[PDB]
Amino acid sequence: KKIKLNIKEFKATAEGLSPEEKELWDKFAEKLKAELNNKIINLGEKIEIEEELKTPTKSIKITFSLELVSEDTFKATLKLEIKGKETIVEEETVEFKAGETVKLTIKLPDGKTFTLELKLEATKI
Secondary structure, eight states: OEEEEEEEEEEEEEESOOHHHHHHHHHHHHHHHHHHTTOEEETTOEEEEEEEEEOSSOEEEEEEEEEEEETTEEEEEEEEEEESSSEEEEEEEEEEETTSOEEEEEEETTTEEEEEEEEEEEEEO
16 A cells, blocks of 8 residues: 655754755755655655765765655654765664654764754555
């Protein structure tokens, strides 16, 4: 069976970000908001939305994964991966219900925080 998602509420904020990090985060957030609104997803289906910054010295990939675990029930992961001299990964996984706000947060060294808050409508179709 299928559901159609809609973004009821959405808020992406950040602290301590460098200009390029903030640009990337805002672009990711807008991409996520547009991709999730009107998204059709099947029971048990996992989807992923990603945005990447590539430069010769470093790559930054932000990914949001969403799984329709059961009726009105979701599992999401927000993940940041930086590939430089070494590779750093930070991520958070949350389980939440349709119609309730969920918050996902990434914290990095030097006072950097990425925060995503959203509320999903799940319409049976």
